[PDB]
């Protein structure tokens, strides 16, 4: 799957509310924070004796992930997220067919 | 879903008639549909949009909505001990105006005038139709009588064209 | 679990039958407390059976600040304004509360 570097799509920002040029980049999940309430509770639950207190997923089945395109509007500098279908090979700004 | 796709078992139902493929005649797009009209659902295999589920093919319903390219149709559907009023939208290429009520409007007018004519003369009548009743007696003029008898059996004739 | 019913949340999974508090002595408790009050009244005669004088205080929080009720005892500032020494007040049937402020 090849996606163009730029894309002209609708912008939800109240400034634009219209089609504007967007820059395409791939979304990447951020680092998990230690201060998140869920992490704080888990660390408390795991402390002391009792061993592993939560399930640990083992039976992985998917061989791909839903890649999310990060579209940054050039007018308002705001971001919108657009998932695409599953694919094994993905790139942004690759050489187009024939060219 | 659950073991059957949307168009499963539609090899024959959704196929076009023999030597009736290609361009759709434009009288289909010149039809006028109103609320309350009766239409017969006949899926056209060439038009893949707004096409009803195979169940509604060959069913007659009542028009309850009109859009730019489609008409809303009410179709009865029996589910266990109940009849459901299924409301579906179908593109006009898949619907034909039904002639199931063609005799109603003309019949009402004839009944109204017959009662009006009878009312003026003070003669109570009934405009109801009746099924075919017994025929009256009559005489048939004599003619030459052709005698029919059983045919002697022949084994050689027990085959189309004989043996 | 069957039918449309509220989700049950009965807290009866412990040994609750060992912690049941019956009230068959409720009539007896009324009798005993009445006898105690009757005995107390004769002991403190002729002092009033209602006990010490209690002050008027407001209810706490926004929900009860419109009403008044009996408090614990008169504040030291109130006693001084009334010209009653704090050490003499409890001996003449006046309740004293050294904690209460006057805002």
């Amino acid at each position: 799957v090849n996606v163009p570097k730029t894309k002209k799509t609708y912008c939800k920002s109240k400034e634009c509310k219209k089609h504007t040029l967007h820059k395409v980049t791939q979304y990447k999940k951020g680092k998990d924070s230690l201060a998140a309430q869920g992490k704080r509770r888990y660390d408390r639950k795991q402390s002391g004796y009792g061993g592993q207190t939560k399930p640990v997923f083992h039976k992985k089945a998917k061989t791909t992930k839903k890649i999310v395109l990060r579209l940054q509007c050039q007018g308002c500098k705001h971001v919108s997220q657009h998932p695409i279908k599953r694919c094994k090979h993905f790139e942004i700004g690759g050489d187009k067919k024939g060219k | 879903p659950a073991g059957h796709g949307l168009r499963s078992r539609t090899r024959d139902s959704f196929s076009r008639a023999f030597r009736k493929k290609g361009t759709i005649a434009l009288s289909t797009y010149l039809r006028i549909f109103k609320i309350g009209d009766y239409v017969d659902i006949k899926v056209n295999g060439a038009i893949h949009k707004g096409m009803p589920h195979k169940f509604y093919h060959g069913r007659t319903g009542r028009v309850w909505n009109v859009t730019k390219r489609a008409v809303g149709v009410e179709v009865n559907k029996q589910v266990r001990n109940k009849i459901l009023r299924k409301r579906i939208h179908v593109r006009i290429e898949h619907v034909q105006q039904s002639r199931c009520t063609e005799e109603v409007r003309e019949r009402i007018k004839k009944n109204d005038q017959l009662k009006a004519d009878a009312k003026a003369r003070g003669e109570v009548i009934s405009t109801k139709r009746q099924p075919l009743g017994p025929k009256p007696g009559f005489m048939v003029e004599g003619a030459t009588l052709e005698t029919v008898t059983p045919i002697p059996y022949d084994v050689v004739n027990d085959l189309k064209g004989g043996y | 679990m069957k039918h449309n019913n509220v989700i049950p949340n009965g807290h009866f999974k412990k040994h609750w039958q060992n912690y049941v508090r019956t009230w068959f002595n409720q009539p007896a408790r009324k009798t005993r407390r009445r006898a105690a009050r009757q005995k107390k009244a004769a002991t403190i005669f002729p002092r009033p059976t209602a006990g010490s004088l209690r002050p008027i205080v407001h209810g706490q929080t926004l929900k009860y600040n419109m009403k008044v009720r009996a408090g614990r005892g008169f504040s030291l500032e109130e006693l001084k304004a009334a010209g009653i020494p704090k050490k003499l007040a409890p001996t003449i049937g006046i309740a004293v509360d050294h904690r209460r402020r006057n805002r």
């Binding site: - | - | 449309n4 019913n5 509220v6 989700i7 949340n9």
Partner: protein, 186 residues
């Protein structure tokens, strides 16, 4: 054999008598059994049937709602097989003749103060044996908590049926199934 259902017998049940043991109600039933039989009046037949009905089938009628339905019908006598309650939301009470099984203490005082009269069904028989010039009224039958829980289940589409929950708040049936942000909204 005979090809019938349940031997041709009815499988429907209706009340042929009051379930109550109230001696006064039974006397009223005897009174209106006679009136319905010996007059053939449709009013008497309706009154007799409604005397059999249960409490929920004899809902109360508020005084305010009684006044609105009696507007422009001063001559007619209002008849209610049920209880008449007082309504503080009604200010002006015109004089009216009302017959009911029971009047609340406040409702009776307001009607009597306004020059009206509170009648029982034995007094009505003397004034309107056939129900002449009567305004027959019924209270709201389906205005009660139980009915809100009836009908299609809360979880099915196009349902506004009230669910059974022990408390009201964010933690009581507001999650998955009640909004798009948790699975689906139903």
């Amino acid at each position: 054999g005979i090809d019938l259902v349940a031997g041709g017998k009815s499988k429907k049940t209706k009340r042929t008598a009051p379930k109550s043991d109230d001696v006064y109600l039974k006397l009223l039933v005897k009174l209106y059994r006679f009136l319905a039989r010996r007059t053939g009046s449709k009013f008497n037949a309706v009154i007799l049937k409604r005397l059999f009905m249960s409490k929920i089938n004899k809902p109360p009628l508020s005084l305010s709602r009684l006044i609105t339905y009696a507007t422009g019908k001063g001559d007619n006598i209002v008849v209610l097989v049920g209880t008449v309650t007082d309504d503080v939301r009604a200010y002006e009470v015109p004089k009216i003749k009302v017959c009911a099984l029971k009047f609340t203490e406040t409702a009776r005082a307001r009607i009597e103060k306004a020059g009206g009269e509170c009648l029982t069904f034995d007094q009505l028989a003397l004034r309107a044996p056939l129900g002449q010039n009567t305004l027959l009224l019924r209270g709201p039958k389906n205005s009660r908590e139980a009915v809100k829980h009836f009908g299609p289940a809360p979880g099915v589409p196009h349902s506004h049926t009230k669910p059974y929950v022990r408390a009201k708040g964010r933690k009581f049936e507001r999650a998955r199934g009640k909004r798009n942000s948790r699975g689906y909204k139903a």
